[PDB]
Amino acid sequence: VEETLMDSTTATAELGWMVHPPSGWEEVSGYDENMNTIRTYQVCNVFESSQNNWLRTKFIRRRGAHRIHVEMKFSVRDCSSIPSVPGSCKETFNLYYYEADFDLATKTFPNWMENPWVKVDTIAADESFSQVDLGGRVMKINTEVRSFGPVSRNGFYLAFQDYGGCMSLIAVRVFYRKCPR
Amino acid sequence: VADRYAVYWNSSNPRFQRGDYHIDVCINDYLDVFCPHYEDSVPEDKTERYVLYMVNFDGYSACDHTSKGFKRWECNRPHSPNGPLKFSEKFQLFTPFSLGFEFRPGREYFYISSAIPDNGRRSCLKLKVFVRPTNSCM
Numbered sequence A: 001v002e003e004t005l006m007d008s009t010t011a012t013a014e015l016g017w018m019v020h021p022p023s024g025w026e027e028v029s030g031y032d033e034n035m036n037t038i039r040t041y042q043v044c045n046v047f048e049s050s051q052n053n054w055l056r057t058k059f060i061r062r063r064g065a066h067r068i069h070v071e072m073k074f075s076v077r078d079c080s081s082i083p084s085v086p087g088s089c090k091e092t093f094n095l096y097y098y099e100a101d102f103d104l105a106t107k108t109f110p111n112w113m114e115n116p117w118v119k120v121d122t123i124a125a126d127e128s129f130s131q132v133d134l135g136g137r138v139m140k141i142n143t144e145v146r147s148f149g150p151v152s153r154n155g156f157y158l159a160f161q162d163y164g165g166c167m168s169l170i171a172v173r174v175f176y177r178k179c180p181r
Numbered sequence B: 001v002a003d004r005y006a007v008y009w010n011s012s013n014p015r016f017q018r019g020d021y022h023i024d025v026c027i028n029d030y031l032d033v034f035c036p037h038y039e040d041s042v043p044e045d046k047t048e049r050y051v052l053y054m055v056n057f058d059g060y061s062a063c064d065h066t067s068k069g070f071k072r073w074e075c076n077r078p079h080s081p082n083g084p085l086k087f088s089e090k091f092q093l094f095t096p097f098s099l100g101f102e103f104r105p106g107r108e109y110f111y112i113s114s115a116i117p118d119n120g121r122r123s124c125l126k127l128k129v130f131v132r133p134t135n136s137c138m
């Protein structure tokens, strides 16, 4: 029933997603829950004030879906486990989407703000990491799933906004359900 | 250099032949390791392949990762598409991912490699990274 529209883990190359402020999100090599190598994104400008870092995915073809589901796997560092604690450090990030009939996204085109971008939600982690453990990684990657459904255009982009946290977007899986019944 | 330091990890590189290859960097600078790359017209015998390890000084000095290092990268694709296979390391203070790698100003870090087809594990190719103290970095 489930149909994947995009899955960052199957890239087997570079994601090449757009980063509005270059000094914010950046693409880096990472690991999957089942201990596998993939392409991930991270931000950690906890020493800089007024952070508003955006990350935009490639154009995602709709393929006959209206209700879109976004599965996000991520790690968020505990703000108290980072020495110089200003007070602006955060542990959440926002997810947005923008639909369009054509790619057309450039680097400026769709303004980088809540205005044109439609907010899906503020994503929080059930488990932030500080250190702990005494044998090896076993559980510290969060999984959050959200949905939205106006999507009527040929495709859409997804955007993630950070505002002063230290986090890593490990994977993003987008899918819809086209029930045979 | 600037902010990104390119390192061509092969035995023909004079920088490695002098055996004391090191780079002076500042927090948030990057290290880009370029694996040996050969066109398709090579019997893959003269083709160099390596496993790269991050080790401590003693491991660095002896060309031994055993009990003193972490396997870091694998230059196992001497025929990758878009140019040489490349691995990158950012000298960041805090990792946004569990037990990732963190670096500190004024400290030295080391990397060594062992040939895959194995030559002898003798005088390995190695690199020392000196992360400059805050006072030096602007």
Ligand SMILES: *[C@@H]1O[C@H](CO)[C@@H](O[C@@H]2O[C@H](CO)[C@@H](O[C@@H]3O[C@H](CO)[C@@H](O)[C@H](O)[C@H]3NC(C)=O)[C@H](O)[C@H]2NC(C)=O)[C@H](O)[C@H]1NC(C)=O
Binding pocket: B007, B008, B009, B010, B012, B013, B014, B035, B036, B037, B038, B084
């Ligand atoms: C073994 O190590 C050698 C020493 O590092 C490598 O030689 C370097 O190859 C680079 C190619 O990736 C050259 O860089 C640039 O390459 C582009 C190709 O797109 C050229 O146009 C540029 O002129 C060239 N130089 C720049 C930066 O403008 C390096 O110049 C070259 N270094 C030198 C002078 O030897 C070997 O490639 C590497 N070989 C193996 C076995 O993998």
Ligand SMILES: [Zn+2]
Binding pocket: B022, B023, B024, B130
């Ligand atoms: Zn030096």
